[PDB]
Symmetry: C5
Subunit: 238 residues, 5 copies
């Protein structure tokens, strides 16, 4: 069947870490203070890039034990993601930010269904209270094989999906990234909302759309609260 | 098919830890005593929140190696759960409470006119005070989406028929087991959390096994790991951590 | 279909550990001797409980890297399993017994009250055999569109299980099985523990049973652990470095 | 059905490592400098082997947390791979290159569809900006069993695959290695490109070919950026 | 359907380890020399057992990161495997040989007094070949819907295996297989060990066999480990830092 076609924007890194609190507590106070200052100077550089419209980023603390902090970073090139990851890992604070999970993808718009397009391809991440991230595949199993469907069938299934999503306009903003050939699943799904319950409302409602019911295969789900840089010192205080 | 609609209550955290006994034994006695005091002061704050009907909590020791202790916490906001876990992780005792497993969810009632949020029994279930039973059981689950066993493709009517049989089986365990179902689609790795409370641990086995012969569980149930534990009264904490 | 009914006995803990030999070697000799004596005093308490018919236990060393030692403990309450686990972990030796795997279950058998029948009582509250070898694995019964054990009629399940029992009876006097149920208690639906003085019989039985329809069509298996009995009088020798 | 037949070339090792930055930072500067010099002397031996047309290699930094660096090594014998692996692990730098993932395979050409053949069997790895690696199986499940299809059925499916691949001529170079009997999947797929987006475009378009849609079973995907040896010192600077 | 019957020989341990190079480098030279000598003395005991025809062993270095070294050990009893494992873990070298993977099985010949035939005995109690290369992986046979190996008749399974044997005999003189059975003993149903002086033959054979119906329709495979022989006279050089 006819392959879908995409427009592609910025590369995206989701970098999840666990905080080594017991080790952090043993670090002398002035060294913790210097590590927090060093980290915030790094983020200052990211903010400069964002203000110049050459990238975007967001920082969230993650609920539960799967992760404690998320750095979501969008850049025009894969090399810039490698350099930002490397610079972060060389900070003192990163010695206490243990690997938890990561995702490499690229902002994607598809063929199924201008300044407005560019705002989506090169998104400034919203400053919402909450974030949700999970990866997904579309199933290739028996009669539930998305990639064997005709283009017309896939278009109609996506139309129904979009109708459900439009009900959550003004409540949730989604950034879909494509990762076929780049990471372990086929898409990254990032949701932003000021009400975390809307993540549950939207995703559960969509599970009854036929495209999700028959073809969705989901990875792990991460939910978090925004970490304003002015709260970093407080958050890491011990 | 028609999407299920939900009533949603308090946010829920299941926080499971393993105890680092070998490291705890090397900590000087007075530092252990201070760590236990500090932990109990934290829980005292949770008890105040519960007495004010603004949350609930439960603490259980877990049998086997998957975990040693469970803190189950209900709060009106996700932020409050995050603040409680951060405060816990900043205690001295938490340095010896190694991560084992966790679960993030919301208390959920289904739709399987009056506003249900105003109904007394609904409010009692949406914002529950957790029972102080001898035993607890926790596991997560999904409903299957495979071939002709696809729960989410069934009509609303078909799903209601299947759930009526489930409820009939569950009502046989009235007065023996209380369930708290939380929803986690969009929040964690499975679709629901199932927490059972009972004064007789065998009832966990009796209920779940009997329910496995109801078609909804037999045909659509997909289960994660099962955690079973015994209640840890706060007055026993010092004794439990004594070395 | 009609739900199966079960008879339930003692709670069961399978506690598997790996031995941290490299760390154990650095512990001074007299501290190792003290640790062994402390462990043996704990086991002496378990033996007292068994002699009073209020529980049972078995200790086996496990072949391969999945585990090195197994403590199998039966008690009348879940609380006692928690207390025994906690007491073991507070010993010095336990600092060198790293977690490997564990299983929590209840001894299970599938008008007169069966709980008053002598043979039922002997199986629900069993004294564990002191055989040369042990084998443990957990299992589920399949729930798939084509073959779903829990959707079968009671009569279909009974027929499948009669054939199973016919195959097992051929191994009478060669292998003793203790089946525990773990629905609602652990990650699989049953625990299977086999005891025999000839480890080959584990292979003979399980492989033959795999051609019974109940196992071929519905068996879903976890990991298999095989071990050799560790008499307490050999513990010091086993831990000698 | 009729088994496929293969021509086989050099053995291939994909050796993925994570960098232990926190430990590297505690090593004295002159010892870090010596470690980098020792590593570069080892790579100099690899370059000599390649110039003599007795093997090939490539070094890439990997984005995300699955790995930080990839050494891809082609040699005529499995023993030579064992020896290179052992020599690398005996360097000081390797103490800070923690195991992440590895793959053992052999360059393979099939009979589905001379100097040119030898240039494919014994390839000089390209110096492209980016690399992508993942392993795969072909499905044996239900009605989708590749190995029970006839030879002619498989040839037709592969003809369509090749037609899609030729559209990416001059943009992506693939090196397919076979690993049945040698590692956990059936093939290794390595893609080289100066445009990382082409990995996504190619792999995603190929997922709509029937052979990939119905039979592809994929492992983890690793994507990286070339590490010139003249940049190693800078990359490891702390 | 009719259960397969087996002739069974020596028990088999596959013990895979990763080498802790960074820690080994910090051990003083004379202690590394002592550790190597102690290890070689242990292997000398194994060689004595083999020369007396009471067991066999092989040592290979494994390519890639899944493992670095393989000890494959055959003994008449499970107890002896457990004792060899324990004696190895108590050597100094073993402190730098981290667990990677293990497999417990028993040499198996199927029926698809034999124990006195010399040729049967050479297969039940094999002297492991000293080939350049080794390959190991475990496998199951599928039990899924209407592709269920254990539901086939004895005659159906025999015919499928006849075709398998036809493909294998083409690799006579190039590859030697040792099949062990592990139902009831480890996590899969069989262990497959291949020996060859040409590692490519592992790929040629396994890939060609994947188009036989028994492998195509019923084969379920675990991880594959491939290695190069480690002569004892090379151990010192291999561990030299």
């Amino acid at each position: 069947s006819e392959a879908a076609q995409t427009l592609d924007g910025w590369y995206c890194l989701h970098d999840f870490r666990t905080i080594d609190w017991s080790a952090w507590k043993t670090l002398p106070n002035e060294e913790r203070e210097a590590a927090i200052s060093e980290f915030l100077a790094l983020v200052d550089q990211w903010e400069t890039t964002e203000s110049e419209k050459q990238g975007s980023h967001a920082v969230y603390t993650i609920v539960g034990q799967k992760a404690d902090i998320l750095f979501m970073i969008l850049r025009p090139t894969l090399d810039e993601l490698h350099e930002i990851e490397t610079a972060l890992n060389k900070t003192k604070l990163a010695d206490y930010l243990l690997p938890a999970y990561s995702y490499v993808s690229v902002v994607e718009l598809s063929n199924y269904l201008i300044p407005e397009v560019r705002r989506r391809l090169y998104p400034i991440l919203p400053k919402t209270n909450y974030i949700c991230f999970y990866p997904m595949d579309k199933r290739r199993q028996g009669n539930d094989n998305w990639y064997m469907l005709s283009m017309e069938q896939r278009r109609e299934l996506m139309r129904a999906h979009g109708m459900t999503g439009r009900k959550y306009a003004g409540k949730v903003t989604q950034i879909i990234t494509g990762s076929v050939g780049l990471d372990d699943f086929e898409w990254g799904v990032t949701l932003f909302s000021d009400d975390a319950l809307q993540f549950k409302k939207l995703v559960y409602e969509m599970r009854f759309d036929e495209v999700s019911a028959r073809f969705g295969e989901f990875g792990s789900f991460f939910v978090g609260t925004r970490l304003p840089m002015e709260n970093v010192s407080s958050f890491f205080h011990v």
